[PDB]
Amino acid sequence: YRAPPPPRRRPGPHSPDPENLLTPRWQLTPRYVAKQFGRHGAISGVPPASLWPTPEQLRELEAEEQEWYPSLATMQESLRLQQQALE
Amino acid sequence: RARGNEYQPSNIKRKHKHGWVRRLSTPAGVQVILRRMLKGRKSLSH
Amino acid sequence: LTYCSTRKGKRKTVKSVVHRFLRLHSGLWLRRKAGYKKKLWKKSTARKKRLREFVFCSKTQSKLLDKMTTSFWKRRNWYAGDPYQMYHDRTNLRV
């Protein structure tokens, strides 16, 4: 006998069918799309501008940053006041 | 007295108490019929 | 306790143990003395000092506490400025 051809992983970018109900949800997110570009680069067909945050998304990131991540000067000033209160 | 003769047959009573029209009158009775259909009973009701 | 959990199929820690005892990596367990915060106005000074101390657990108690906790609580933790840094190891122990 001759053995069957060796099993191989499917090559190239893979875009699942959106309409098909069976197709798993996780494969249709933008997160999945970006992963195709990372592995296969240009041949993925992803428009690179999509990889970066969109202007509405950019505002959300900046809004989140201000609330929870203060600037160095504010951090220093608050620490200074606490020492004075302790002193 | 001697027991064991509690069945006193009467066709009018039998069909009124356990018949087709009686079973379909209430949803609980209809579900009785559905159960017997799913089992494959030859006799769904009296 | 739970040996095989429904969701993950794993052993489960008894959290009442984690809330009362400290495990040193060498295998020892630390605990407080029962009653060290109770009715101090009628206890002798030497008695109060004995109560305040941190105390070790016996071999059987250590074996039980090992069964009631999972491996995550037995690992090495490299805490900066750890006050128990020196007590996670045994020195000159021949036995």
Partner: protein
Amino acid sequence: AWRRDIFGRIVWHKFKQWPIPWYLNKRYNRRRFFAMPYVDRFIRLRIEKHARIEARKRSLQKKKEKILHAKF
């Protein structure tokens, strides 16, 4: 017409001749051509019951082919 009976099945209904229209016939109107929600659980059970029968029949054919090829 194609109608759903009270048991949740689809059956062809043969019409009968009457001298009055359907909305004025009290005997006819008492007949129900709809199924209430308590029937859906039974509808699924029939589908699953039938699916088991089909699965066994297909398996048995495959088993029977084994005997033929082994024998011949």
